[PDB]
Amino acid sequence: MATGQDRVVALVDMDCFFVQVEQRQNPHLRNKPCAVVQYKSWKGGGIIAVSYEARAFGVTRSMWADDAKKLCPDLLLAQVRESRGKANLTKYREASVEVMEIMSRFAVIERASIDEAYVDLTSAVQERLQKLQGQPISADLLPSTYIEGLPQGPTVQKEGMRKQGLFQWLDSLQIDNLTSPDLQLTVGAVIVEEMRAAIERETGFQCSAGISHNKVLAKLACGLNKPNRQTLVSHGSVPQLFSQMPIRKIRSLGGKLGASVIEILGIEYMGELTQFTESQLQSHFGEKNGSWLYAMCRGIEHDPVKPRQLPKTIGCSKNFPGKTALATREQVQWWLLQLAQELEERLTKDRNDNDRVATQLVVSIRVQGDKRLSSLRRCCALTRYDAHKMSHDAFTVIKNCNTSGIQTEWSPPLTMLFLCATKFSAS
DNA sequence: ATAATGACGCT
DNA sequence: AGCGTCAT
Ligand SMILES: Cc1cn([C@@H]2OC[C@H](OP(=O)(O)OP(=O)(O)OP(=O)(O)O)[C@H]2O)c(=O)[nH]c1=O
Ligand SMILES: [Ca+2]
Ligand SMILES: [Ca+2]
Structure with a gap:
């Protein structure tokens, strides 16, 4: 089990x-x-x-x-x-890199977004346990932590509620058993109290944090008490927490798939997914879905904290909504060059900062009407980080879609230009 | 007329 | 490879 x-x-x-x-x-x-x-x-x-x-x-x-x-x-x-x-x-990407650096010290992180990191603290929590002589955990070590579920049983001040819940937790604690899951959750939490305190001291930026056993519970935990707070969500708090948790609030259930779990199964909250067998679920949503689903409503999930503090593609897009859509050759070429230019500026800075090089250029467009975010998408080669080469080659691989004989003008009007750099390798 | 940007699954 | 999904 x-x-x-x-x-x-x-x-x-x-x-x-x-x-x-x-x-x-x-x-x-x-x-x-x-x-x-x-x-x-x-x-x-x-x-x-x-x-x-x-x-x-x-x-x-x-x-x-x-x-x-x-x-x-x-x-x-x-x-x-x-x-x-x-x-x-x-300005923000620079600001983000400041924070990811501090976080990189404490453990092994996964850049989720400009704003977010996952952190696998497992090995780090083992390291700190033996470095406390199995002595207790003071409330003072967790001045901004909440314990989902607590306080329970037999107070009007919001912070007063917080102490009670943390005090109930620290009291129930099995600190002689250095392999107790609930104890770890607590050590990682103090570490996060620290890394959060380091981020603020060294950049001035405050942040929220969720601590649990996988990426999905951590994200959900992180939303429970914002701002400048952190929530710990332990295994045992999952049934009540999921008890009335809407399904769409779980990372990956926010779109169509999650919508139809509500539709097909007639439920509305995450706990209701317990009552189904894995084969039942695989049968409704697929082998990998019914599996991941069946483990998720039990608070189990195993997507790993991939260590990757840098993105894998570098992209520059621009939207031309409504009457601003480009409809001339001269317009399309000018933006392809404007995008190409910031692109090489980001690209060059990547070649010298993170020591690597993109090798394929992806060009995408989107026309007036088509509700798909991308109407077209074509891969061509990327050799030198030259803005003009990239513009011309972008135009090349999309010139065959100006469906107006008049080469001065362009139809259908383009409502989006995307230039994305992918296929990185060593440098 | 919510814009820019990014990860990944499917085929 | 080209599209679709999902998140941020
Ligand atoms: C939803 C959404 C978010 N972002 C940005 O990605 C990081 C951040 O995401 P966030 O939701 O965390 O924004 P935020 O103010 O920091 O809100 P809180 O942290 O107070 O909740 C927000 O700056 C987008 O670029 N596009 C989007 O469509
Ligand atoms: Ca965010
Ligand atoms: Ca945020």
């Missing part, structure tokens, strides 16, 4: 990251309702991050800045920096 408590895994999530990045750069933005915005033209810009002060008014991501200034008129606005006509997030 295996129960998926082999590993200790954490998901670190920087809190309102871009907002934190701007606020470190611009002290006026601190302790204030503010938001990051890109492209001022259309309705003031689309809001891509929201400080917690501004959330309290109702302001959300993707929302237009002119609309959100209706909800919050005191909303300050850091514009994203524009470069060659495209929104340029270099």
